[PDB]
């Protein structure tokens, strides 16, 4: 037997490592793999087809004992594959369906986003926008869902033009600001589902001569080191990336070694850190 | 050599209504079932009053025989949790804990979701008025199951009276006096959600006693799939929470805590399932 664990990204390891979420999740993954003498393995394919092939060779090689998926996408072929080959794997993120069958690690993203939206609403904001990554990712749907419900519960409208999907990058944050700040009735607060987008939102808002947070409040997610040092420092939700990783690996090795298993879900705590990007609105 | 190997279950009062609730046998089933895999025996507290129980825990730790502790129930302002945390003693908790969720390891159902799910079901049947009977209010599970439903309705735009809301103690008797109370006002809801199978049973029987035909007159859903649930009348609408697995997953968690010095606090979430036999 060989103990190595496979890691699967949502895209090229090169795109992934530009996002500080990933080195931190891997850092948690590794910290545990160490405890049980497991090593790590990832494929290099950039393309979706290439990433599939990647996972397939992993399973075909009989050298990988288990696989951690660092993401959760709707209709992931990767999951259809692993489920059919009966290969041991674990999610970081809610699965679209079969919660009962799949073992996953996640934050309560629905509630984190609800809480962020409650936070802004208690601040008197009534025109609140959401900027996320892919629609097809479940962390995005959930984060959307929680802020959305929070708005409907306080009787606050959420127009289609305040909901944005882009990839997670700074540029995304800049195009969002173009779109949002370009409307006839723009938002006064903004929730970004990723610090990269937060950081970009900030620069873009500042290139246009706005001031955060007097003109626009921003909350974002993930606590990137960069968020601490942004000017002004970003309110963000710490989502405990490392523990997501550590706990994912601990769940997988258990699944692999025990080999008779029950599927559970593991919820790692989040924390809203209010730094400097939010101001009162009343 | 060198092995002791046993876990401590902080039991409810022997004279409490909770001891007799089916939730506990089933949770102990899970606990013993996993405990057996690692060869842990179970030791249980016998106290009746809150002080006696507290003493028991102090005895458990002090004796140094017992590896870790499971708290079967969740009390507010909790003293035992405080003492345990201070003694650096590994413990796990069935149910959400009001405070320090971040600092404790616990095992739960997504009760808020389940309640929402239940509500959306009834609406789909499309019931204008829905009422709620809960075990008394402080326990979180009640608060969450309340919130879940109260939200789905609000989203729905259905309205909750504050008379559709009740709160009395997890007893078959409790579910009796509620049916008498609820059919008491000018409007009868025609749907109900109860947070406990005992309550659900006294709800089915108190409206047999009044000449109301379930499901066609009044529709009922209740939690926990006691499986007293199957027996009762027409079989129910129930949310089955796999209590066995709560117990099992709680033990797995503690044994890990006991053996590997695992600090990290996480919530472990057991899947639920809305069966519908009304
Ligand atoms: O909340 C847990 C969450 O972690 C990961 O989500 C990442 C995402 O993949 C990254 O690209 C970046 O955008 O930040 C997210 C963290 O907030 C898992 O991919 C996701 O499935 C899971 O929900
Ligand atoms: O959802 C799991 C829920 O379980 C417990 O709640 C019990 C309660 O203790 C019983 O007396 C009765 O109300 O059945 C409930 C479960 O349906 C705990 O509160 C905790 O495990 C958790 O929140």
The answer for A 230-269 residues in CB contact with B (under 8 A) is 243, 246-247, 262-269
What is the rounded distance in angstroms from the CA atom of residue B65 to the CA atom of residue B90? Answer: 13
What is the rounded distance in angstroms from the CA atom of residue A15 to the CA atom of residue A6? Answer: 18
- Report angle CA B167, B143, B146 to the nearest 5 degrees: 75
Burial class from Cβ neighbours inside 10 Å (0-12, 13-18, 19+) for residue A196 reads: buried
CB B222 within 8 A of CB B241: no
What is the rounded distance in angstroms from the CA atom of residue A188 to the CA atom of residue A180? Answer: 10
Structure-determination technique:
X-ray
- A106 at interface of B, judged by CB pairs closer than 8 A: no
| Fold (topology level) of A109-238+271-282 | Rossmann fold (3.40.50)
Is the C-beta atom of A130 inside 6 A of ligand 1? no
| Fold (topology level) of B111-240+273-278 | Rossmann fold (3.40.50)
Is the C-beta atom of B95 inside 6 A of ligand 2? yes
- How far does the CA of residue B204 sit from the closest CA of chain A (Å)? 30
Q: Which of B248, B269, B272 to mutate to test the interface with A (most CBs of A within 10 A)?
A: B269
- B39 at interface of A, judged by CB pairs closer than 8 A: no
What is the rounded distance in angstroms from the CA atom of residue B225 to the CA atom of residue B206? Answer: 19
Residues pairing with A271 in the sheet: A238
What is the rounded distance in angstroms from the CA atom of residue A18 to the CA atom of residue A167? Answer: 12
What is the rounded distance in angstroms from the CA atom of residue A95 to the CA atom of residue A142? Answer: 11
- Report angle CA B191, B152, B178 to the nearest 5 degrees: 35
What is the rounded distance in angstroms from the CA atom of residue B193 to the CA atom of residue B102? Answer: 30
Residue B179: its H or E element: helix B172-182
Q: Beta strands of B175-224 (E only): which ranges?
A: 191-194, 219-223
- Report angle CA B50, B54, B58 to the nearest 5 degrees: 170
Query: Resolution in angstroms, to 1 decimal, for this deposition?
Result: 2.8
CB B86 within 8 A of CB B112: no
Residues pairing with A52 in the sheet: none
**Phi/psi of residue B204, nearest 5 degrees:** -75, -35
Is the C-beta atom of A220 inside 6 A of ligand 1? no
Q: How many residues does chain B have?
A: 278
Nearest ligand (C-alpha, residue B229)? 2
CA of residue B107 to ligand 1 center, whole Å: 23
Q: What is the CA radius of gyration of chain B?
A: 20
3-state secondary structure labels for all residues of chain A:
CCCEEEEECCCCHHHHCCCCHHHHHHHHHHHHHHHCCCEEEECCCCCHHHHHHHHHHHHHCCCCCEEEECCCECCCHHHHHHHHCCCCEEEECCCCCCCCCCCEEECCHHHHHHHHHHHHHHCCCCCEEEEECCCCEHHHHHHHHHHHHHHHHCCCCCCHHHEEECCCCHHHHHHHHHHHHCCCCCCCEEEECCHHHHHHHHHHHHHCCCCCCCCCEEEEECCCHHHHHCCCCCEEEECCHHHHHHHHHHHHHHHHHHCCCCCCEEECCCEEECCCCCCCCC
Pairing status of strand B66-71 against strand B91-94: parallel
SS3 content of chain B, % helix, strand, coil (to 5): 40, 20, 40
Distance from chain centroid for Cα B97: 12
Q: Residue B193 in 3-state DSSP?
A: strand
Which is nearest to A147 in space by CA: A166, A164, A168?
A: A164
What is the rounded distance in angstroms from the CA atom of residue A82 to the CA atom of residue B220? Answer: 40
CB A143 within 8 A of CB A193: yes
Neighbours of A2 (CB within 10 A): 11
Tokens in use for B198?
Answer: 């005992």
Which is nearest to A164 in space by CA: A137, A134, A188?
A: A134
Residue written as token pair 């609730």: B21
**Phi/psi of residue A214, nearest 5 degrees:** -65, -45
Asked if B266 and A267 come within 8 Å (Cβ–Cβ), the reply is yes
CA of residue A106 to ligand 2 center, whole Å: 23
Sheet of B91-94: strand order equals A39-42, A4-8, A66-69, A89-92, A104-106, A265-267, B267-270, B106-109, B91-94, B66-71, B6-10, B41-44
Pairing status of strand A66-69 against strand A89-92: parallel
Helix A170-181 with A195-207: angle, nearest 10 deg: 50
What is the rounded distance in angstroms from the CA atom of residue B199 to the CA atom of residue B174? Answer: 6
**Phi/psi of residue A33, nearest 5 degrees:** -50, -40
Tokens in use for B89?
Answer: 């003693």
Which is nearest to B178 in space by CA: B170, B122, B186?
A: B170
Per-domain boundaries in chain A:
1-108+239-270, 109-238+271-282
Asked if A267 and B268 come within 8 Å (Cβ–Cβ), the reply is yes
B257 contact residues in A (CB cutoff 8 A): none
Q: Residue B252 in 3-state DSSP?
A: helix
Convert B46-66 to b/e letters by CB count within 10 Å (16 or more is b): ebeeeeebbebbeebbeeeeb
- B155 at interface of A, judged by CB pairs closer than 8 A: yes
Which is nearest to A107 in space by CA: A249, A239, A272, A250?
A: A239
| The ligand 1 atom nearest the CA atom of A10 | 9
Class for domain A1-108+239-270, per CATH?
alpha beta
Tokens in use for B250?
Answer: 């709680």
Tokens in use for B177?
Answer: 């006096």
Which is nearest to A50 in space by CA: A78, A79, A85, A81?
A: A78
Q: Looking at domain B1-110+241-272, which CATH architecture does it have?
A: 3-Layer(aba) Sandwich (3.40)
Nearest CA to ligand 2 atom 6: B141
- Report angle CA A66, A67, A70 to the nearest 5 degrees: 155
Pairing status of strand B6-10 against strand A271-273: unpaired
CB A182 within 8 A of CB A209: no
Neighbours of A135 (CB within 10 A): 11
Nearest ligand (C-alpha, residue B106)? 2
Residues pairing with A219 in the sheet: A191, A235
**Phi/psi of residue B8, nearest 5 degrees:** -110, 125
Q: Residue B131 in 3-state DSSP?
A: strand
Of A149, A262, A266, the CB nearest to B266: A266
Distance from chain centroid for Cα B259: 28
CB B130 within 8 A of CB B193: yes
CA of residue A139 to ligand 1 center, whole Å: 6
B111-240+273-278 shares the fold of B1-110+241-272: yes
Residue B53: its H or E element: helix B50-63
Is the C-beta atom of B225 inside 6 A of ligand 2? no
A102 contact residues in B (CB cutoff 8 A): none
The dihedral region occupied by B126, where left means phi > 0, alpha psi between -120 and 50, and beta the remainder, is left
Residues pairing with B238 in the sheet: B222, B275
Which is nearest to A9 in space by CA: A78, A100, A110?
A: A78
């Amino acid at each position: 037997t060989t103990k190595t664990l496979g890691l699967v990204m949502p895209s090229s390891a090169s795109k992934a490592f530009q996002n500080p979420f990933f080195p931190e999740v891997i850092r948690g993954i590794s910290s545990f793999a160490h405890v049980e003498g497991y090593a790590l393995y990832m494929s290099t394919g950039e393309t979706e087809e290439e990433i599939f092939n990647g996972v397939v060779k992993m399973v075909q090689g009989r050298q990988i004992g288990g696989i951690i998926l660092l993401y959760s996408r709707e209709n992931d072929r990767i999951i259809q594959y692993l489920h059919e080959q009966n290969f041991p794997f674990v999610l970081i993120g809610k699965p679209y369906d079969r919660k009962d069958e799949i073992t996953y690690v996640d934050n309560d993203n629905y509630t984190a986003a609800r809480e962020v939206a409650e936070y802004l609403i208690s601040l008197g904001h009534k025109q609140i926008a959401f900027i996320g990554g892919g629609s097809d990712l479940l962390v995005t749907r959930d984060r959307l869902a929680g802020m959305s419900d929070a708005l409907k519960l306080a009787d606050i409208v959420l127009p289609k033009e305040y909901i944005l999907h882009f990839d997670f990058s700074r540029e995304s944050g800049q195009q969002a600001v173009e779109e949002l700040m370009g409307l006839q009735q723009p938002p006064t607060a903004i929730m970004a589902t990723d610090d990269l987008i937060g950081l970009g939102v900030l620069s873009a808002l500042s290139k246009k001569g706005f001031v955060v947070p007097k003109d626009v409040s921003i909350v974002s997610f993930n606590n990137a080191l960069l968020s601490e040092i942004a000017s002004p420092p970003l309110s963000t939700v710490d989502v405990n990336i490392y523990q997501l990783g550590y706990e994912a690996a601990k769940a997988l090795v258990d699944k692999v070694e025990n080999a008779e298993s029950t599927a559970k879900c593991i919820i790692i705590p989040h924390k809203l850190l209010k730094r400097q990007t939010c101001e009162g609105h009343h």
